[PDB]
């Protein structure tokens, strides 16, 4: 129990932090990855002067603060502001004292060696946690779907990745990163919806375009004869009621937004798209392992939640793969937390105890110890 | 050889038919499941607009 | 749900067959032939009992492993009641 | 204003302790009795051996035993495995409760290291006089 | 150091006295702290066989000064946590057992009937009202029975 | 003969799998379609309790 209860799992994202206790089924804490700094001197009624704001209080009060994102494209870019988000996570969100909890953290696919050593330096030397561990994100997603070999298409708020994993070892030279994700996708909907003849003028109009994207957006299979369908004008249309009455209608654009993930050309991106990239990762791997990867395309991440994403991907890679092959696109329902759940499982596991980096290992080996 | 060829063609035609109406069962499933997250969603909305107008 | 029937066969048969040989491998090791046959006469005496003890040895353990499961089986019954009691979907 | 109510509670305690006190003394009864059953069971399944004559008997008996050994051993094995299965079943249940409550009392597996009382005894042998449990110590008279 | 406080606050001179004698034997050279090696020796004398990883973890559990060694203070802390855990385990075990004795019908519960029996089984003099009263006070989920959880709670304190 | 036999066995195993998860797609179809006539029903009810309390 000492640490059975006690292991923490913190998944640091570009848009959201997911956090909680190893053992739980889902994150106890989910909140924006921002750190707000007040543009002016003054106070809220009853509070003192605050130097900084994090998560939702930074979002809610955004009009008087300069908002900053510590993690650009999955990599920690500002370490002063990240230690601020961690502090908030332990002390306010989970309300635990960190110096008696083992902490499993996550990093990104080709996270620079030096960063994995730096967050270890900050975990052990400024938070004084007993022990910690850094798992790679795609690797926890895979594992949370039971398996050990597969290829994860991972897509969240600032990055998309393909991480081919074989008997647990993520394959460095076959990993692909595509910098277009849910953030890019909300801003494109924004324009095709103002372009539908609308105005997201106040900040209460801006924010909810993102809630339109999440609730009403679709990834149609045969996106071709779906536009064609749009035109005959079926009961395909969908009206959403705004903060007030102002019933906005979205028929068609509803799927023009996730067609951006297959066609980056919709947004002036010259890069290849999700399905081709799944494939290219795969023809960059060893030959003998390619049947395995093909029957185990595990999807994780908030942006892979658009319904019919899996069917489109299913048919997208069948038709690029040699017919002798078995294609299989696994997309679980909890996928917006796969990464986290894979960490919860792993860290609550009976056999993981012997991989925890302890302060004994650290004080004796330097940050190098956990770096592997 | 001949026997194995003929019962093979009949295995493949039954496979092709069984794949075709499967595609159809899955598309109808997906359609109904989607119409639903829409109706069930519309409802949390009408029931919440409700405790609100009844309290007001 | 009948496409999962082929899963039953593969799965069950698989695991069960895996378990078998293991048990065979394991049990085989712990077995040293009765090689000593007609090498001495009083040998049987100092031998027979040793076998006797080994038997008694195993017997006694089997009894303990047994009583153990019973106790555990009860731990379960209780651990299940705590699970239901701790349901309250409220 | 329920001034007397205080005595009611003390009763439950007095009784609770009358219960536990009862428990403990019954606990060792069942324990020893249990053992008794164990020696009787063994009493017949493998009674005080009596080495036979000399020729065919010793050999025969030996063969008899040796075969039974593979027998009992197999049974011993099957049993060990049904235990494994069981311990497994309750570990899972010992989970379905954790992430539904948290750390709860009396986990079935219990990861225990040696007690400090043990380590102390082990290391100082003779001079280890402190029936440690919890009782703090504050100046007597 | 804050821990080393209550820790020493917890123990008695007697305790410290012995925990010292014990600590001294841990410490070979007699310098002032158990090293990752000095510990290994005692562990084996104690009948274990830890690995480098295992040892350190056991060390840096009470190494507040990031020394990589244990001083008679960090040690007392360690003894304390143990003393605690030991006593907790022994308690829950006993109660656990008591529940099985009181249960006997093995339904995993203790119904007003058994509660009466066991109670009446004590020397003490009791009338039904007492029994049903203790039931009503113990049964928090008001289901009639007393689950192990409740039993832990109800016996919480009692000796 | 050999080739026609082996791609025949692979035609039959793909047919058997395709029938199995079809059964599964249809059972989930049925289940979701039924949960729905129930949710959509519950709704005409909460929306009609509504025009009523809103008018009152």
């Amino acid at each position: 129990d000492e640490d059975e209860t006690t292991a923490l799992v913190c998944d640091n994202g570009s848009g959201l932090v997911k956090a909680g206790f190893a053992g739980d089924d889902a994150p106890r804490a989910v909140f924006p990855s921002i750190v707000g700094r007040p543009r002016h001197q003054g106070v809220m009624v009853g509070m003192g002067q605050k130097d900084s704001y994090v998560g939702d209080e930074a979002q809610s009060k955004r009009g008087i603060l300069t908002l900053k994102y510590p993690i650009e494209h999955g990599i920690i870019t500002n370490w002063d502001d990240m230690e601020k988000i961690w502090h908030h996570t332990f002390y306010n969100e989970l309300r635990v004292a960190p110096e008696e909890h083992p902490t499993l953290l996550t990093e990104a696919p080709l996270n620079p060696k030096a960063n994995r050593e730096k967050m270890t330096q900050i975990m052990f030397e400024t938070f004084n946690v007993p022990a910690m561990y850094v798992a790679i994100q795609a690797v926890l997603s895979l594992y949370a779907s039971g398996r050990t070999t597969g290829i994860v298409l991972d897509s969240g708020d600032g990055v998309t990745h393909n991480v081919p994993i074989y008997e647990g070892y993520a394959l460095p030279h076959a990993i692909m990163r595509l910098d277009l994700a849910g953030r890019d996708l909300t801003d494109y909907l924004m324009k095709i919806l103002t372009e539908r003849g609308y105005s997201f003028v106040t900040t209460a109009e801006r924010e909810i375009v993102r809630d339109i994207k999440e609730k009403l957006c679709y990834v149609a299979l045969d996106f071709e004869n779906e536009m064609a369908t749009a035109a005959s004008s079926s009961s395909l249309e969908k009206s959403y009621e705004l903060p007030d009455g102002q019933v906005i209608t979205i028929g068609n654009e509803r799927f023009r937004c996730p067609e951006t993930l297959f066609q980056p050309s919709f947004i002036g991106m010259e890069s290849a798209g999700i399905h081709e990239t799944t494939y290219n990762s795969i023809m960059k791997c060893d030959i003998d392992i390619r049947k395995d990867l093909y029957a185990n395309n595990v999807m994780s991440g908030g942006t892979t939640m658009y319904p019919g994403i899996a069917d489109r991907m299913q048919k997208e890679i069948t038709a690029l793969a040699p017919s002798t092959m078995k294609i299989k696109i696994i997309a679980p329902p909890e996928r917006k937390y796969s990464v986290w759940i894979g960490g919860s499982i792993l860290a609550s596991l009976s056999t993981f105890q012997q991989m925890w980096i302890t302060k004994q290992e650290y004080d004796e080996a330097g940050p190098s110890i956990v770096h592997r | 050889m001949q026997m194995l060829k003929l019962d093979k063609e009949n295995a493949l035609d039954r496979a092709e038919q069984a794949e075709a109406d499967k595609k159809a069962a899955e598309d109808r499933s997906k359609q109904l499941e989607d119409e639903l997250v829409s109706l069930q969603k519309k409802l949390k909305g009408t029931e919440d607009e409700l405790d609100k107008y009844s309290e007001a | 749900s009948y496409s999962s029937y082929l899963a039953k066969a593969d799965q069950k048969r698989g695991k069960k067959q895996t378990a078998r040989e293991t048990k065979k491998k394991v049990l085989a090791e712990r077995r040293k032939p009765l090689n000593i046959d007609h090498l001495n006469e009083d040998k049987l005496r100092d031998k027979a009992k040793e076998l006797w003890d080994w038997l008694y040895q195993l017997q006694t353990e089997k009894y303990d492993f047994a009583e153990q499961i019973k106790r555990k089986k009860y731990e379960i019954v209780t651990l299940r009641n705590r699970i239901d009691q701790a349901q309250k979907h409220s | 204003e329920e001034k007397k109510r205080r005595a009611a509670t003390a009763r439950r305690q007095h009784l609770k302790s009358a219960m536990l006190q009862l428990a403990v003394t019954e606990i060792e009864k069942e324990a020893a009795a249990k053992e008794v059953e164990k020696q009787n069971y063994l009493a017949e399944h493998s009674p005080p051996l009596s080495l036979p004559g000399s020729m065919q008997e010793l050999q025969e008996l030996s063969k008899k035993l040796h075969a039974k050994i593979d027998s009992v051993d197999e049974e011993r094995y099957d049993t060990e495995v049904k235990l494994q299965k069981t311990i497994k079943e309750l570990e899972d249940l010992s989970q379905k409760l954790f992430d539904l409550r948290g750390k709860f009392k009396r986990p079935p597996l219990r990861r225990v290291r040696m007690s400090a009382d043990a380590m102390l005894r082990a290391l100082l042998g003779s001079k280890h006089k402190v029936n440690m449990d919890l009782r703090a110590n504050l100046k007597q008279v | 150091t804050d821990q080393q406080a209550e820790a020493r606050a917890f123990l008695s001179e007697e305790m410290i006295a012995e925990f010292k004698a014990a600590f001294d034997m841990f410490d070979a050279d007699g310098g002032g702290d158990i090293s990752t090696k000095e510990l290994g020796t005692v562990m084996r004398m104690l009948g274990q066989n830890p690995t480098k990883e295992e040892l350190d973890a056991i060390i840096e559990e009470v190494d507040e000064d990031g020394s990589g060694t244990i001083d008679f203070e960090e040690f007392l802390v360690m003894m304390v946590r143990q003393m605690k855990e030991d006593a907790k385990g022994k308690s829950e075990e006993e109660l656990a057992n008591c529940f099985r004795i009181f249960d006997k019908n093995a339904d995993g519960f203790i119904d007003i009937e058994e509660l009466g029996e066991i109670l009446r089984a004590t020397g003490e003099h009791v009338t039904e009202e007492d029994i049903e009263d203790l039931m009503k006070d113990s049964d928090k989920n008001n289901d009639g029975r007393i689950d192990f959880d409740e039993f832990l709670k109800m016996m919480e304190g009692v000796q």
Side-chain angles (χ1 to χ4, degrees), chain A residues 2 130-131 354 357-361 363-364, chain E residues 36 55-57 59-62 66 68 85:
Chain A
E2 285 54 60
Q354 26 286 145
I357 294 318
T358 59
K359 40 67 182 181
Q360 209 263 22
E361 262 95 313
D363 295 315
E364 278 162 74
Chain E
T36 188
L55 272 159
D56 296 300
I59 307 174
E60 46 82 303
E61 261 187 293
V62 272
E85 280 296 303

Side-chain angles (χ1 to χ4, degrees), chain D residues 116-117 120 128-134, chain E residues 15 18-19 83:
Chain D
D117 185 58
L120 252 46
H128 165 41
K129 219 299 94 177
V130 187
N131 56 179
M132 47 200 95
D133 58 317
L134 184 286
Chain E
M15 298 260 71
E18 296 195 12
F19 277 122
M83 304 245 288

Side-chain angles (χ1 to χ4, degrees), chain D residues 9 15 22-24 29 38 44 60 65-66 69 73 81 86 92 106 109 113 121-122 139:
Chain D
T9 59
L15 286 187
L22 202 175
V24 65
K29 284 209 300 167
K38 184 190 188 178
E44 34 184 41
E60 210 70 289
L65 302 193
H66 184 284
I69 294 180
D73 194 47
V81 178
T86 306
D92 303 359
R106 263 286 291 182
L109 286 297
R113 264 163 31 165
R121 171 149 305 305
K139 297 60 186 292

Side-chain angles (χ1 to χ4, degrees), chain D residues 11-64:
Chain D
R11 253 290 267 187
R12 275 173 290 246
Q13 304 313 93
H14 178 70
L15 286 187
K16 292 181 180 168
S17 184
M19 291 179 62
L20 294 182
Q21 199 171 311
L22 202 175
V24 65
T25 198
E26 205 72 19
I27 234 132
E28 44 180 65
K29 284 209 300 167
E30 177 190 64
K34 205 93 183 73
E35 182 78 53
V36 182
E37 306 197 306
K38 184 190 188 178
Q39 290 315 323
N40 297 172
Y41 168 92
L42 297 185
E44 34 184 41
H45 294 289
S46 177
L49 168 144
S50 187
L51 33 287
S54 38
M55 42 193 280
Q56 220 188 201
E57 44 247 345
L58 300 186
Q59 299 185 175
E60 210 70 289
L61 180 59
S62 294
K63 191 186 67 183
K64 175 102 60 188

